[PDB]
Amino acid sequence: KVVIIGAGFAGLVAARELQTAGIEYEILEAKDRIGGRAWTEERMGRPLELGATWVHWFQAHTWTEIMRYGQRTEITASPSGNDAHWVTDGKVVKGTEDDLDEKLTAAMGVTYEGSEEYFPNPHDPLWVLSDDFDGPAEVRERFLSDDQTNAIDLVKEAGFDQETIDLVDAFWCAGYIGDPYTGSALMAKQWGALSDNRYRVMEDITLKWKLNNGMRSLYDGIAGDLNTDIRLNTPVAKVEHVTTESGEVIEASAVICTVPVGALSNIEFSPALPDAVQSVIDDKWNSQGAKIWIKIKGHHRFLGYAPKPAKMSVVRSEYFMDDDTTILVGFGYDNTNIDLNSIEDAQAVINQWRDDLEVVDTTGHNWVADKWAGQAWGTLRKGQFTQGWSLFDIDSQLFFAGSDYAYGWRGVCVDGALEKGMTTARQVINSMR
């Protein structure tokens, strides 16, 4: 009687929540598999996360799932102490990972500068704009002005040298997973608030701990608790507010739609979504990048930073294989400028820093070109912190759930999908009671 569109983390956790309350539900999933933009698959001789990878106990919703399904001790840290290379004035500089981290730390300190006034409760991201904001008017003005500023311009205005600008350029090409110069700096500021305003805490939370048994141990865990079957290979095309696809029509008390913004053009809504919501769909988010896995010869502890418009902006060693090869991960700002499955393209990526390392394999999934995704992880363009993700939360019987609409670790983390799927389910339960 409640229809859930999509079998990613948001949809799966909503279903389990409905089940506990005794409410009948049904999940419709377009693809042949569950998990969505989290996807654990064997490639290049080992389980690889083609989507989501990193977790942390400071992420309440992800961590409780880790505990529920037996993964408490099944996490391992990405390797550290890599030889670092970064591109700055068209040239390559070699240093240690702590040289890079200390430069990033100082720049992040300046990047976070208003978060304590904006986010005393970092899970109340729009407090500054609410009727109960008790602070000074200048705080609200700087808040709105920061939504129209990108994170790199904050560091330029503070007078860092060109080297640090190129480092934060590289950093945010990965962070925004797209063009950082069109992004809203408020996204970076909330990440700080959620990480006690320290760069190393932010990095431990988002880029350190990997699941030994992969994201699939969590999403197969949730699906395994479900008492109703998931309808795979059942894309939705219309929703009225209940509608349907390929002729089959569904009736239901309510609809929980977890389809990402980048793929909402495949569904017709009747009545049409409000103008401000539709303008986000047309403008979507800031997530046009791509994630690659590259295998090279030998065992090498490697870290590489390169600014826009490089094919990949952050590349790091992750696994040391038993046949004397290394698997590195990389993040790049523009999916249309790299073939993730072309060994030549992967060799061109490594050649950004070194001429002596040899690519032997490469793989990835281009989430942006994926018809049922149309983006990577959700990130914010200028203006979308205050007029973006919050427009989706109208539709008395239609609900938007998903990591891209979360209050906390929005878009970039499974924690946001687990948060928003569960609370949307509670919205449905409360209204029915």
Ligand X SMILES: Cc1cc2nc3c(=O)[nH]c(=O)nc-3n(C[C@H](O)[C@H](O)[C@H](O)COP(=O)(O)OP(=O)(O)OC[C@H]3O[C@@H](n4cnc5c(N)ncnc54)[C@H](O)[C@@H]3O)c2cc1C
Ligand Y SMILES: NC[C@@H](O)c1ccc(O)cc1
* Nearest distance from C-beta of residue 205 to ligand Y, angstroms: 8
Binding of residue 367 to ligand X (CB under 6 A):
yes
Cβ nearer to ligand Y, comparing 14 with 55: 55
Containing H/E element for 314?
strand 314-321
Binding of residue 244 to ligand X (CB under 6 A):
no
Residue in the shown chain whose Cβ atom is closest to ligand Y: 206
Q: Find the binder of ligand X among 259, 329, 340, 349 (CB under 6 A).
A: 259
Q: Are 392 and 405 in contact (CB under 8 A)?
A: yes
Q: What is the DSSP letter of 183?
A: B
Residue 220 to residue 147: CA distance in whole angstroms:
38
Binding of residue 4 to ligand X (CB under 6 A):
no
Residue 167 to residue 101: CA distance in whole angstroms:
10
Binding of residue 209 to ligand X (CB under 6 A):
no
Q: What is the DSSP letter of 393?
A: -
Cβ nearer to ligand X, comparing 128 with 255: 255
Q: Find the binder of ligand X among 69, 293, 377, 399 (CB under 6 A).
A: 377
Residue in the shown chain whose Cβ atom is closest to ligand X: 36
Binding of residue 395 to ligand X (CB under 6 A):
no
Q: Find the binder of ligand X among 260, 304, 330, 332 (CB under 6 A).
A: 260
* Nearest distance from C-beta of residue 230 to ligand X, angstroms: 10
Cβ nearer to ligand Y, comparing 174 with 277: 174
Q: Are 83 and 96 in contact (CB under 8 A)?
A: yes
Binding of residue 235 to ligand X (CB under 6 A):
yes
> Which of 221, 289, 292, 223 minimizes the C-alpha distance to 48?
292
- At which residue do the structure tokens 């080992």 appear? 46
Residue 180 to residue 141: CA distance in whole angstroms:
23
- Which residues are registered as beta bridge partners of 92? 87
* Nearest distance from C-beta of residue 52 to ligand X, angstroms: 3
Q: What does the binding site for ligand Y look like in residue numbers (CB under 6 A)?
A: 54, 171, 174-175, 206-207, 314, 331, 412
Residue 302 to residue 78: CA distance in whole angstroms:
12
Measured between alpha carbons, how far is residue 285 from residues 19, 292, 310, 368, 388 in Å? 32, 21, 21, 11, 9
Phi-psi region of 70 (alpha: psi -120 to 50; beta: other; left: phi over 0): left
Residue 74 to residue 213: CA distance in whole angstroms:
7
Cβ nearer to ligand X, comparing 51 with 192: 51
User: Which range of residues in 28-36, 84-92, 134-142, 272-280 is near ligand X by CB under 6 A?
Assistant: 28-36
Which of ligand Y, ligand X, none has residue 414 at its interface (CB below 5 to 8 Å by kind)?
ligand X
Summarize as ranges the residues that interact with ligand X (CB under 6 A): 5-11, 28-31, 36-38, 51-54, 235-236, 258-260, 263, 266-267, 291, 367, 372-373, 376-377, 402-403, 413-414, 416-417
